Specification:
Elements: no helix or strand
Length: 15
């Protein structure tokens, strides 16, 4: 979701 850690298809970084 464009944050920091974890995969996030919206943008690397879920939280």
């Amino acid at each position: 979701l464009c944050v920091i850690v974890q995969a996030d298809w919206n943008c690397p970084g879920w939280f």
